[PDB]
Every structure is written in C-alpha cells, then in structure tokens.
Amino acid sequence: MLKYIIPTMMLMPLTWLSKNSMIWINTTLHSLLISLTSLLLLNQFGDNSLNFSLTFFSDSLSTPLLILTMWLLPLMLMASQHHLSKENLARKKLFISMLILLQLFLIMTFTATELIFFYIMFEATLVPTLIIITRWGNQTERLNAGLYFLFYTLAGSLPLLVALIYIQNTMGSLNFLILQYWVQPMPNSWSNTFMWLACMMAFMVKMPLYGLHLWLPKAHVEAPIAGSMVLAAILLKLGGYGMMRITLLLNPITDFMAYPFIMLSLWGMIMTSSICLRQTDLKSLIAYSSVSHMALVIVAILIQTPWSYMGATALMIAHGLTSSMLFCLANSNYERVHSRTMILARGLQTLLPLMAAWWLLASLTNLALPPSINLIGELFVVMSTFSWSNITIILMGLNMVITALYSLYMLITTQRGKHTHHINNILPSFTRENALMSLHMLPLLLLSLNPKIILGPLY
Amino acid sequence: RDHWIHVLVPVGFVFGYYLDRKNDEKLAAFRNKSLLYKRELKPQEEVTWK
Amino acid sequence: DAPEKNYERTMAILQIESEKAELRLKELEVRRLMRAKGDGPWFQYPTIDKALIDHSPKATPDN
Amino acid sequence: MSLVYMNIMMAFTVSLTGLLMYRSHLMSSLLCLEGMMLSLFILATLMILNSHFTLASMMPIILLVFAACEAALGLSLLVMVSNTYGTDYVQNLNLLQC
Amino acid sequence: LLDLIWLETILPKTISLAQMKMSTTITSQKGLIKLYFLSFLITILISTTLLNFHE
Amino acid sequence: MNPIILIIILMTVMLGTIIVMISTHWLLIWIGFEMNMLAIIPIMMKKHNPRATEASTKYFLTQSTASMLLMMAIIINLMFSGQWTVMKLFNPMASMLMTMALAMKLGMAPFHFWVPEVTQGIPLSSGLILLTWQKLAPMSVLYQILPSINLDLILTLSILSITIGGWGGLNQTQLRKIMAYSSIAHMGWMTAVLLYNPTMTLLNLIIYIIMTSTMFTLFMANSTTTTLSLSHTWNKAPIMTILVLITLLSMGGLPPLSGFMPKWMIIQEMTKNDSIILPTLMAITALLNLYFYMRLTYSTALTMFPSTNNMKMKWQFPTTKRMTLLPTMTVLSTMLLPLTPILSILE
Amino acid sequence: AKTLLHQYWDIPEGTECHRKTYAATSIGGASGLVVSAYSVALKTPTSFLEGVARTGRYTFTAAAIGAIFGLTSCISAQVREKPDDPLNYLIGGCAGGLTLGARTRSYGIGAAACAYMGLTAALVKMGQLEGWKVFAEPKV
Amino acid sequence: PFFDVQKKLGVDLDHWMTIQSAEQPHRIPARCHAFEKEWIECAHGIGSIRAE
Amino acid sequence: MMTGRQARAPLQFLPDEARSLPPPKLTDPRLAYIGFLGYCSGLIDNAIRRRPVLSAGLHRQFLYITSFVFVGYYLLKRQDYMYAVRDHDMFSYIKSHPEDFPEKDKKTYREVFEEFHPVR
Ligand SMILES: CCCCCCCCCCCCCCCCCC(=O)OC[C@H](COP(=O)([O-])OCC[N+](C)(C)C)OC(=O)CCCCCCCCCCCCCCCCC
C-alpha cells in the first residue's frame, strides 16, 4: 500500500512548492494520477485477500472504499476552488494540505491489518475534518458543529480503545488476519455485553445511528463543500467498514445484542426520511437522507448474512457517489444565491437545463432507480432483511415510498415550477461545475455495467 | 528542469512501488514451501517468485 | 501479483504475527509470575547492600 | 512502643491541626509550623538517643538548621505581606481567587 | 420534537450542563488560605478515620 | 535581579532536585526539598507585586506543611525500621503520610488548592518551572517508594486529581490557571499508572513536560496571559496560532499526535492488570481537558477575533525574544507517536 | 467505611429488608457527612446554625437516597425472586434518583438522577456479579 | 528516577548514615547492631518481594 | 519493571553487552523519521522568526537534521537493547521454570468440539 501512501504524501510538496496559480491544477492532475493508479487494488482473489505486509492488506471490502477515497480528492479540489479563490494563498495551501492529509489517513485506515492502528488512523481522520469544518465553514455554527462532531466520536471511541487493548491482551493480537483464525465465540455475560457495546458504539456514531446522529445535520451542513463531500462520501463509511471488521469478534452475542439497534435503524430510516419531507435547508435535507441511507447499512451489518454484506457495501459505495453529487449540486446553487433555503431559488430548469438534468440523475440514483448500484445495494439489503423477518418489508417498503417522496420534491422545489422573480444573479453553469457533476455520475453509472467489484469480500 | 514539479508524485509512486517489491523479499520465508504451490525448480531458475 | 506470491506472502505474515502474539501472551504470563514470586530479574525492588555493614570488633562485645 | 513517643506524636498532631486551622494571623501559623518542627526534633532525638545510632546524632541539628532557615524565609514572606496591608491577616491574601 | 429537542436534550445538553455546573462548583473558591487548609485537615481525617488508608 | 544571582538560584533549584534524585538517605531527600523550595521562592517574587508575594506565601505554607509531613513519615520509618534507606516504607502510617506529603508537593487533589492560585500570581517562566521542573522530585520519590504505596490511596488521589483538574479549566479564561488545572489532571494520570508500570509514569511525565514547556514557551513568545489576549496572535504572528493549535490538539490526547501516546500506554498497562472501569472513566474524564483545549484553539487558531488599531504598529517589529527550543519542543510534542516504542529507554 | 460496604454486601438480596435498608441508609449518611464536611469547609456558613442546617440537610438527603435505594431494590428482588439481577438495582437507582429530585424540589434533576443513578447501580450490580474491579491490584 | 550517581562515580555521599550497622565513630555499636546485621545479610540481593 | 536488572550497573546508557547486538543501519526508517523531525524543526525555526522557510539557514537546518539523527541513533540503539533484554529475561525465566509453562496438548479440530450458532 506504500505505492499509494508515498504519492499522497508527495502531494504535500506538490502543493507547497507550486506556483501561486498552479496549486489547483497540479494537485488535480496528480491526484487523478493516483486515482488511476488505485485500480491495481482490484487484484482480488476468491479465497485470499490482497495481503501486502504486516501493516497493510486490502480485501474486496476495503478496495472499493479506497478507490472511492482516492477518486474523491480531485473532485473535492474541483468543488472547493471557486469559493476559496479570494482566500489567502497560504490558507489555500493549508486547505489543500488538510484534504491531502485526510486522504492519507483514510487510505491507511481502510488498509489497517491491525486494529489499534485502525483506531489510530480512524481517530486521526477527525483532526483535518475538524479543522476544515471549523476553519473554512461559512456560518457561525461551524464551531459548535465541530464540537459535536469531535465529542460524539471521541465519547464513542475511547471505550473502543479500551476494548481493542483488552482484545490485544486476551487474544494476543489485533491483526485481523490472525483473528480470522483465533476468534473465540463470545458467550453471554454482562462483561461480554459491554465488550460488545464498547466495540460497536463508536461505529454506531460514525455511521450514524438514529438518536446518536445529532452531529451530522450540523457537521455536514456547516462544513464547506469539500468537507461535506468527504464527510458524506467516506467518513460515514468508516463506521460500516469497522463494523464489518469487528463483528467477526462479536459472535454469537451479536445475534441477541443487535435487537435494539436494528429497531433504532428500522425506525430511524422511517423518521429521518420523514424529516427530509419538511426540511427547508436543502443541505440538511441531504444530511438526513444520508442518515436514512446509512440506517440500512447498519441493519444489514447487524443481521450479518452474506446478501446483507454485499448489499451494504454496494449501498456504501453508491451512497458515497450519490450523496457527494447531491452536496455538490446544492453547492452549485449556493454559489449563485448565497443561501441554503430550498424554497428560495425555484424553477432552475428554465434557466439551467443541463444542470437540471444532473439534478434529475442524482435524484433518480437517490431514489434507487434500477439498475443503479444504489438499487443493487438497496435491493440486496431488503432481500436479506426479508430473510431476517418477513414483517420488515413494511418498514422497508414504506421507506422506499418516502425515499422517493423527498427525492422528487427536492427536484420539484428547486428545478421546477415558476422561477423566482427577484433572483437575477443565476449565472449559466460553468464547465467546472458540470465537470464535477459528470465525474460524480459517470463512474456511478459505469458501475452498473460491472457491479461485482463493489460487492465486498463474499461475492 | 523547466517542469521538475510534475515528477514528485509519479516518482513517489515508482519509489513506493520499489519499496513494495523491497518488502516482498522480506516476506519470502514460505517461498516454494507452501503445501499448495511447492514444486521442483525449473532449470535456470532459483526462486519461484521475486 | 501472482497468486503464489500473495499466498506464500500471507503465510509469512501469519507466521510472524502468530509468533508475536504467542510472545505477547508469554510476556504477560512472565510478568504475572515475576510480580507474584519476585524470583526473576524483573520487579527486583532494592534492599540494603550488605557491603555497608562494619564487620570490625566494636567497643562492646555483646553484638 | 514507649510512652513518651505518644506525647511527642500527639504534640505534632496538635501543632498540625493548629497549622491546619488558621484563625487570623500568619505569625500564629508560623508558630504552629515551628512547633511541628520542634516536635520532630524531640522525636528524632529520642529515637537516635534510644537506639544509640551514633552517626544520626548530627541528624536533628541539620533538621534544626534547614528548617530554622525555612522559618526565616517565612518571616520575610510575612513581612512583605505586612508591607502591603498593614497587618499579617490571612484574609487579606485573597487576590488570587480570580 | 425528537431530533431538534429530545434526542438533543438527553445526550448532549444534559451532559454539557452537568459539566458546566460541576465546573462552576469546583472553581467557586474564595481564595482563602484558611479554608484550603481546613479542607486539608478534613481530608486527612477522612483518609484516616473514614477510609482507613493508614492500615 | 542580578543575572549572576539568577544563575546561582536556578542552579540551586536544579541542585535540590538532583539531590532528591541521586541520594539514598532520607535526610538528603528532605534536604533536597528544603533547598528546592528555599531557592525557588525568589523566582516567584521576580516582578515584586502583591500577587507574587501572596503566591509565594501560599506556596511556602503548602510546601512547608508537606515537608513537615515528609519528615514525620521519615521519623516513623526510623521508628519501625531503624534505618534510613530511600526504598520501601516499613509502616502504612509512614506510607500514608509520605504519599500525602508528595501529593501536597505535586498539587494533587484534594491538595490541588494552591496550584491555580500560585501559577496565577507568578510570571510565565516561574510558572513553567513550577509546572515542569517541580514535578520531578516528588515523582522520583514516588518512583522509589511504590512497593509501600497503598493502592486505594494513590488511585483515589489519581481519579480525584483527574476529575477536579478536568472540571477546573472549563470555567477558566486565564491561561496560567488553565495550565494549572491541566497540571492537576495530568498528575492524576501519572500517579494512576504508578503502581502498575512506573515506566509509563516516566513516559507521561516526559511528554507532559515537553507539551507544557511548548505551551509556556508560546505564551512567553506571544506575551499573552489570557485567552482574549492570546486571540490577538493571528494578526501579529500567524505561525504561532498554528503552533498553539497543534500543541493543544496534542495535549488533549488526540491521535496521531504524541500526547495521545502516554494515556494510551497508561490504558495499555491498566487493562493488563484487569482494571477496565478505571482507565475508561479516566479517558472519558480527559474529554473535559480536551474541551477547554478546543475552546482555546477556537479563540486562537480556528477563528479570527477582532484586534485593535495599535497592532498595526507591532507589525513593524519582529520578535526579539529568545524562544529557546520552541521548534524542537513543538516538533517533539506533536510528531512523536510513530516513535512510540522508544519508551523502552525509560525502563 | 470500607466495612459499611462489607456489612451491606454480605447479606443476600431480598432476604432481610430492614437491615439492608439500614446499611444503605448508613452508607448514604456517611457520604452525606463527607460532603457536608467539605461543604462547610470550602464554603463558610454565615453562622453555626446555618452550618448544622447544611450538614443535616445534605446528610438527610443522601441518607434518604440510600434508604429508598436499599428498600426499593430489596422489595423488587423479593417480588421478582431474582436476586442475581441488575434490574432490581435499576429500579432502586431510579427510586434513589426520584428521592434526590424530591429533596432538591425539581422534576428534571429527578428524572436525570433516576436515569444516571439507575445505570450506575445496574453497573455496580454487574460488577459485583462478574467481579469487575475498579481499584484493581497490580498483577503483571 | 533513581539516578545512582554515587555507585556510578564511586563516591560515598550518604551511605554511611543509612544503617546502624555501618562504620560508626570509635566503633560504637548500636543497641540492635546484631539484629540489623542479620536482617540485612538475610535480605541482601534477593529483592524486596522475596525479602518480606 | 526492569529496575533491578539495570541496578548492578547503574547509569549506563548502552552497556557492554549492548555491543553484542546489531546496531541500526544508517538507512533505518525510524532514523529517517527522526531526520525528518530535524527538518521540520528547521522549518518551524525559520517560520517563527519570519525567515524564508526553505532558503534561510541551510547550515542551521543541516545542524537540526544532524543533531536529531545523532541523538536518535543512540536512542534507537538503547531501545533495541532494552527490548532484547526484555526478551532475554523472558526466555531465561521460561527455561528456568518449566513447571509454570507446560507444553499444551494441541488437538486438531476433529476432536475439538465447538458449539455451532446459526445466523438466521
Ligand atoms: C457516544 C456516546 C456513547 C458511547 C458509548 C460507548 C459504549 C458504551 C459502553 C461502554 C462501557 C465502558 C467500556 C467497556 C470496555 C469493556 C472491555 C472489557 O473487557 O469488558 C469486560 C470487563 C470485565 O472484566 P474482565 O474482563 O477483567 O473480567 C474477567 C472475566 N470475568 C468476567 C469472567 C471475570 O468489564 C469491566 O471490567 C467493566 C465493563 C463496564 C464498564 C462500566 C464503566 C463505564 C460506564 C459506561 C461509559 C460509557 C461512555 C461514557 C461517555 C458517554 C458520553 C459522555
């Protein structure tokens, strides 16, 4: 994995030694070169994971998250270069440094062979995210949002530290490859109950779990566009990655510990989606949609059937692409009206037709239109949870109604109807913005041709 | 060089690729010793992989 | 990479990490026994050096 | 143990609680502190004279001298307090609550 | 009701008000040397008589 | 002060601490503490205002009381052991009194009640000495008497120091009191891992001294003693805001920084000893310390508070202050976690 | 007061209600006396009458919390016939929290003290069951 | 930290006043010289944990 | 923990038997990281005094790199020494106490019965 970590670190001299007008073009070019290089991780086998060293390996779960992560950096650089154009050159280089450093932490978070190194990188991802939100966020509430984002994650994860060090003392190792073969069944006790909670609640917060999700409609909304892209597209999916790693060590206790949390998700996706029907802030509507979509990933990991893991990792990759594009579309209208009120700018298909078509495609992938990998993940999770209990389809199916309802209302409020009269600074769509939308949507639609690469280690 | 900055990240790949190969020889204890892939060495060949 | 290379490299990784895990378990057991019995080189909390004792004939004999 | 050690330890605790429960003055506090030092002198002296451990007979003198020097330091501190407020009252020493 | 009030009430706001209130009770000291040494005497008495840390 | 007299007085402070470190007799331990206090008193009264004299009076009273309890513990040790070796203590009463005396010297709760006062009353350099160098000698004696330290006593002092030093700094706007309550919390962290593994005690002491020296050196470089004066730094010295950012994110124990290193290792030596509740509660209580560190970083680095007009004059004068070891300490207090197994040099 | 906890925990649950209630009452009264001592220490009352009033108020508050805790936990463990069950101490801890809310004359503090003291008393019962140690002896 | 400067440099700063069984002026024995000599020669080298 | 081991020969940074151990190479990744810390110290020293960060004081940056590599080399030597002493004491203690470390009967999974828990 050292053929990826070293170019990501060489992106630091590539942004701090660049000419003052070349610091976006060079970082975009070489980050796209790293993203083209990321395809070598697709050397996956049906039996063995691509095991590099004592420190790094990459199975078919971590590989699509890595390719999405290394792809997301050029898209964040294209997204965040317009509103940081009047910024000081040193703070501009510091912003690019925080994005590069966050990618650097993420690519060795997903390839951590050992779990306490996973913890160190997993909590290392807080600090560039916290600095990006609380420094380049636009409104007043970025400080409070950074506080909530920091202290939900740390309060969930400092018991995870004690739990992982307890596994290191008990089993002898926190290598995942060793613990595939030295896993002991976890019996029923209160000690093993709080063992389970300490191993799970950090990732429950990072997914987020319903009831614990209060950081997210502040952290995703008060962030800048690159912060919202990396928080929605990757940093939620650390929780699903970590749960899929750590429920190896939590059997058969998960079979009766998952019962409340599944309820919290199966009801939570009914609530948060319903919250999306009454959100006046468009960016908050996309945030609660992200909560509603990650509730299915929580359910699928907690029922721990193969169809559920295949659908959950397909839903993670698909929601990363779709939610990143929806935040970028909301930014494309925020850079024209300078407000996030959804009812303010209306009728935008009369003025911006191709950008309305990008809104249309992002809304159709949001509502899981087949054969998108959104629908492949959604459908496979629904199959596995019908196998879990035959009544859950009601909570699934009603969700698939409400998920349609706000996905098109967002399309009807913003793009359709009569245009707002007094708003006259609606510029034509830049080539940069349509490039951003196309680089989100075209990989998402190409993955419908060959979806087996985003279906996880048990395809 | 007039464009010396466009070789920081590619050479950082190449060097990094080199280190990966450099680590493979440090994990070569079971080379031609696995119960699945052990075999007699072909003529003019000293290692099965590098 | 060849599947041979990944396979045998994985066997090397698993041997090294299994050895380190067994050595950490032995390390915990050794520390527990040496704190319990005090007979090993660790947890040797210091006592008085008997080289400080004056073994000369003192002023009074009853000592 | 011996019965005089009871009284010397109890004297140390009496002067402790006097030094740990101020009334008003810093001078009365330093008096209780030097009573503590005096009781330590008496107790170390009675041990060292008891056990006939010869080399420690220079020990309480040292315990005097350092601590008497310590008393000098405290007296000078008191004087600086009395060069601000006119008294040595401990309730005037509350500028560091905020 | 839930995700602007109650789930916001139980976890972050109750804990934040608890930490604020304990912080205002700890640092509400009057700076008096007499009171600190009287607290030290109460400390030594509870450590000896009430907790038996001298045994 | 005469600089020759300043050099002799600082060498006498260092001499008293070294005499505590290198001696095998209890009277020389007591002599080292007496010499250390007697020499550090003028460092506190350097600027000659009533806050320094009040702070020196409070420091004298607490350290004199601790020295008397120390000598009483030594005298009871001579009662019940007949000898003077600096080693384990041969009476639980002498062990309790010496643990109390060293807790009073460190400022561990509930004997913490002099640390935010005195550090407020004295200059930043003398507070640096008080919070870094004056923690060395009692932790050395606690290192050497740990076969006789009562477990419940040292753990009560540790958790009470961590909780009270956590709830102290949340109400604080004065930087020296923030460093004082941070001192109380970190001394609780040091003494909690004491009876389990004193190498991690030494690691926590060294990393804390590095981070505290970094923060006081930044405070002396920027000449700021309040939060609201530290908030003027971005308009004067923008690099110093980045330095206080990374150092305060280090002091909260946030990975991948070096201040995550001690407490993690402390947990790494407490779950071995089947204590799971106690390092969990300690780690959750450290979030309070991290909260007021985040408050300081919000005021200084991550936002821009309004400055005044006269700051435009200070744009024309570079810093002529001897910021000794500030790049070295700033690098060591942030980027040292990949060198975590270096801790075996403290074994 | 280490033996206060020992004369509390030696009796099995749901067997002798009056002595368990008295032992928890004495534990709460001792904790109230400690808090009263530090409270009249760090904050000087205006008179000796105010000092004995604060001491009696804090002591009776904490002792009533302990009394209703021990009473409610013992009666719940009798009516359920499940002594090795932390739901009994969950009910008793919510009873002690409502006692604290009644003494502090507030509902919100009562509900918060119910929740947190119930989870705390449940954790204490689980620690007595599975042998969780807070002041663990050094072993390795 | 016990920086044993005395054993490293070979100097005798404070070991002489440490025990009663040490070299006393004019060969004066303590009243418990034999008992302390026996306890020290028993407990020497074996560590405190074994020596208790 | 090992304070009785390094008490017969106190205040030795590297003892004589430390020379039995192989020293770290000069291309040690840890030593390269400490040299990187020296470079970062040089850049921060130029940044705090308002100097050109890459340009000013190449002699000073080179002494930063040299001094940190020099200190860190001996720190890494002592580190490797103390972990080798840890393992030496461990292995000598296991060899000297066979009764505390019995050889376990390693049973294959044809005899080993694990309870099966179906996930459905
Ligand atoms: C984001 C906010 C919510 C975060 C929730 C985090 C998870 C919730 C539960 C955490 C419990 C604490 C960590 C447990 C680690 C268990 C490791 C282990 O070995 O356990 C077995 C051990 C058992 O000990 P043992 O394993 O040595 O025993 C040997 C085995 N037997 C039992 C057979 C003898 O458990 C314990 O020792 C105690 C476990 C419970 C600890 C209770 C204290 C903490 C209370 C909850 C705090 C929750 C977060 C607080 C902050 C909230 C926000 C401000």
UniProtKB/Swiss-Prot annotation, chain A:
Source organism: Ovis aries
Membrane topology label: Multi-pass membrane protein
Q: What is its EC number?
A: 7.1.1.2
Q: How does it assemble?
A: Core subunit of respiratory chain NADH dehydrogenase (Complex I) which is composed of 45 different subunits.
Give the stretches traversing the membrane.
Answer: 22-42, 60-80, 98-118, 147-167, 196-216, 224-244, 256-276, 284-303, 308-330, 351-371, 391-411
The similarity comment for this entry is: Belongs to the complex I subunit 4 family.
Q: Which GO terms describe its cellular component?
A: mitochondrial inner membrane; respiratory chain complex I
Q: What class of enzyme is it?
A: translocase
Q: What is this protein called?
A: NADH-ubiquinone oxidoreductase chain 4
Q: Which InterPro entries match?
A: NADH4_N (IPR000260), NADH_Q_OxRdtase_chainM/4 (IPR010227), NADH_UbQ_OxRdtase (IPR003918), ND/Mrp_TM (IPR001750)
The record's function comment reads: Core subunit of the mitochondrial membrane respiratory chain NADH dehydrogenase (Complex I) which catalyzes electron transfer from NADH through the respiratory chain, using ubiquinone as an electron acceptor. Essential for the catalytic activity and assembly of complex I.
Query: Catalysed reaction(s)?
Result: a ubiquinone + NADH + 5 H(+)(in) = a ubiquinol + NAD(+) + 4 H(+)(out)
| Localization per Swiss-Prot or TrEMBL | Mitochondrion inner membrane
What is one Gene Ontology biological process annotated in the Swiss-Prot or TrEMBL record? mitochondrial electron transport, NADH to ubiquinone
This entry's Gene Ontology molecular function terms read:
NADH dehydrogenase (ubiquinone) activity; ubiquinone binding
Keywords, ordered alphabetically? Electron transport, Membrane, Mitochondrion, Mitochondrion inner membrane, NAD, Respiratory chain, Translocase, Transmembrane, Transmembrane helix, Transport, Ubiquinone
Swiss-Prot record, chain D:
Gene Ontology annotations for the cellular component aspect, listed alphabetically: mitochondrial inner membrane; respiratory chain complex I
Please cite one Gene Ontology biological process associated with this protein. Answer: ATP synthesis coupled electron transport
Return the InterPro entries for the record.
NADH_UbQ_OxRdtase_chain4L/K, NUOK/Mnh_C1-like
Membrane topology, as annotated: Multi-pass membrane protein
Q: Which reaction does it catalyse?
A: a ubiquinone + NADH + 5 H(+)(in) = a ubiquinol + NAD(+) + 4 H(+)(out)
Return the similarity comment: Belongs to the complex I subunit 4L family.
Name of the protein in its database record: NADH-ubiquinone oxidoreductase chain 4L
Species annotation: Ovis aries (Sheep)
The gene is MT-ND4L
Swiss-Prot record, chain E:
What domain of life is recorded for the organism? Eukaryota
Chain segments annotated as transmembrane: 31-51
Subcellular locations according to the entry = Mitochondrion inner membrane
Tell me which family the UniProt entry assigns to this protein.
Belongs to the complex I subunit 5 family.
Give the function comment from the record.
Answer: Core subunit of the mitochondrial membrane respiratory chain NADH dehydrogenase (Complex I) which catalyzes electron transfer from NADH through the respiratory chain, using ubiquinone as an electron acceptor. Essential for the catalytic activity and assembly of complex I.
Q: What does the record note on quaternary structure?
A: Core subunit of respiratory chain NADH dehydrogenase (Complex I) which is composed of 45 different subunits.
Protein name (Swiss-Prot/TrEMBL): NADH-ubiquinone oxidoreductase chain 5
Taxonomy of origin reads: Eukaryota, Metazoa, Chordata, Craniata, Vertebrata
Shown part of the complete sequence: 552 to 606 of 606
Swiss-Prot record, chain F:
Which catalytic reaction applies to this protein? Answer: a ubiquinone + NADH + 5 H(+)(in) = a ubiquinol + NAD(+) + 4 H(+)(out)
| GO function terms (MF aspect) | NADH dehydrogenase (ubiquinone) activity
Q: Which UniProt keywords apply?
A: Electron transport, Membrane, Mitochondrion, Mitochondrion inner membrane, NAD, Respiratory chain, Translocase, Transmembrane, Transmembrane helix, Transport, Ubiquinone
What does the subunit comment say?
Core subunit of respiratory chain NADH dehydrogenase (Complex I) which is composed of 45 different subunits. Interacts with TMEM242.
- Gene that this polypeptide is encoded by: MT-ND2
GO BP term, pick one: mitochondrial electron transport, NADH to ubiquinone
- The identity of this protein, by name, is NADH-ubiquinone oxidoreductase chain 2
Look up and give the membrane topology term: Multi-pass membrane protein
From what organism does this protein derive?
Ovis aries (Sheep)
Q: State its Enzyme Commission number(s).
A: 7.1.1.2
| Presence of the UniProt keyword DNA repair in the record | no
Provide the function of this protein. Answer: Core subunit of the mitochondrial membrane respiratory chain NADH dehydrogenase (Complex I) which catalyzes electron transfer from NADH through the respiratory chain, using ubiquinone as an electron acceptor. Essential for the catalytic activity and assembly of complex I.
Q: What subcellular locations does the record give?
A: Mitochondrion inner membrane
Give Gene Ontology CC terms.
Answer: mitochondrial inner membrane; respiratory chain complex I
Query: What protein family is recorded?
Result: Belongs to the complex I subunit 2 family.
Is-annotated flag, keyword Electron transport?
yes
Q: Which InterPro entries match?
A: Complex_I_Subunit_2, NADH_DH_su2_C, NADH_UbQ_OxRdtase_chain2, ND/Mrp_TM
